[PDB]
């Protein structure tokens, strides 16, 4: 999945085949540094990719004066009443109007979606 | 010619009295507008 780098030349490690022990080795093209990986999966491609933005929503959006606010949706963690909300705010989304919420209490930053 | 010289008797105009409605009509229009805005709000709530 991710990119792993050689410790000698600090270049990308390409996958190379070990035709003796039937094992996967990551080797670079600059030096002869070898490795054994734990992912065991070279490549992964998901075409749905309906990523939940709760990973990508920052908790600092609560300081936006231009966002709507509601008090009928208390925070799950700290029980604070006021909570900002907004829409998906994502391009390349075929169809979405679901709301997202962020707690406005400082240092809480709870970001959920009912 | 005939209609113009007769129109010199009847006359024609356009004014605010011709562009103003009645109180009952104003109430009807405002009611309809409020109902439509409420329905739009309901649709938005269902979408959310
Ligand atoms: Zn290397
Ligand atoms: Zn909270």
UniProtKB/Swiss-Prot annotation, chain A:
Signal peptide: none annotated. SUPFAM superfamilies: Zinc beta-ribbon. Its main location: nucleus. One of its GO terms (biological process) is transcription-coupled nucleotide-excision repair. One of its GO terms (molecular function) is DNA-directed RNA polymerase activity. Zn(2+) 2 binds at residues 75, 78, 103, 108. It comes from the Eukaryota. DNA-dependent RNA polymerase catalyzes the transcription of DNA into RNA using the four ribonucleoside triphosphates as substrates. Component of RNA polymerase II which synthesizes mRNA precursors and many functional non-coding RNAs. Pol II is the central component of the basal RNA polymerase II transcription machinery. It is composed of mobile elements that move relative to each other. POLR2I/RPB9 is part of the upper jaw surrounding the central large cleft and thought to grab the incoming DNA template. This is DNA-directed RNA polymerase II subunit RPB9. It comes from Bos taurus.
Curated annotation (Swiss-Prot), chain B:
Coiled coil: none annotated. The tandem heptapeptide repeats in the C-terminal domain (CTD) can be highly phosphorylated. The phosphorylation activates Pol II. Phosphorylation occurs mainly at residues 'Ser-2' and 'Ser-5' of the heptapeptide repeat and is mediated, at least, by CDK7 and CDK9. POLR2A associated with DNA is specifically phosphorylated at 'Ser-5' of the CTD by CDK7, promoting transcription initiation by triggering dissociation from DNA. Phosphorylated at 'Ser-2', Ser-5' and 'Ser-7' of the CTD by CDK9 (P-TEFb complex), promoting transcription elongation. Among tandem heptapeptide repeats of the C-terminal domain (CTD) some do not match the Y-S-P-T-S-P-S consensus, the seventh serine residue 'Ser-7' being replaced by a lysine. 'Lys-7' in these non-consensus heptapeptide repeats can be alternatively acetylated, methylated and dimethylated. EP300 is one of the enzyme able to acetylate 'Lys-7'. Acetylation at 'Lys-7' of non-consensus heptapeptide repeats is associated with 'Ser-2' phosphorylation and active transcription. Regulates initiation or early elongation steps of transcription specially for inducible genes. It is found in: Nucleus; Cytoplasm; Chromosome. Catalytic core component of RNA polymerase II (Pol II), a DNA-dependent RNA polymerase which synthesizes mRNA precursors and many functional non-coding RNAs using the four ribonucleoside triphosphates as substrates. Pol II-mediated transcription cycle proceeds through transcription initiation, transcription elongation and transcription termination stages. Component of the RNA polymerase II (Pol II) core complex consisting of 12 subunits: a ten-subunit catalytic core composed of POLR2A/RPB1, POLR2B/RPB2, POLR2C/RPB3, POLR2I/RPB9, POLR2J/RPB11, POLR2E/RPABC1, POLR2F/RPABC2, POLR2H/RPABC3, POLR2K/RPABC4 and POLR2L/RPABC5 and a mobile stalk composed of two subunits POLR2D/RPB4 and POLR2G/RPB7, protruding from the core and functioning primarily in transcription initiation. Part of Pol II(G) complex, in which Pol II core associates with an additional subunit POLR2M; unlike conventional Pol II, Pol II(G) functions as a transcriptional repressor. The C-terminal domain (CTD) serves as a platform for assembly of factors that regulate transcription initiation, elongation, termination and mRNA processing. The trigger loop allows entry of NTPs into the active site, switching between an open and closed state with each NTP addition cycle. This is DNA-directed RNA polymerase II subunit RPB1. It comes from Bos taurus (Bovine). The chain holds residues 674 to 721 of 1970 of the full protein.
């Amino acid at each position: 999945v991710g990119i792993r780098f050689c410790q000698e030349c600090n270049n990308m490690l390409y996958p190379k085949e070990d035709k003796e022990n039937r094992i996967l080795l990551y080797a670079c093209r600059n030096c002869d540094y070898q490795q054994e990986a734990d992912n065991s999966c070279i490549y992964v491609n998901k075409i749905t990719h309906e990523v939940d933005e709760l990973t990508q929503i920052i908790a600092d959006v609560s300081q936006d004066p231009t966002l709507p606010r509601t008090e009928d949706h208390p925070c799950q963690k700290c029980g604070h009443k006021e909570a900002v909300f907004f829409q998906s705010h994502s391009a390349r989304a075929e169809d979405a109007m679901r709301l997202y919420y962020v707690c406005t209490a400082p240092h809480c930053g709870h970001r959920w979606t009912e | 010619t005939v209609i113009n010289n007769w129109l010199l008797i009847e006359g024609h105009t356009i004014g605010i009295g011709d562009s103003i409605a009645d109180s009952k009509t104003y109430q009807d229009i405002q009611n309809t507008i409020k109902k439509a805005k409420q329905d739009v709000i309901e649709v938005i709530e269902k979408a959310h």
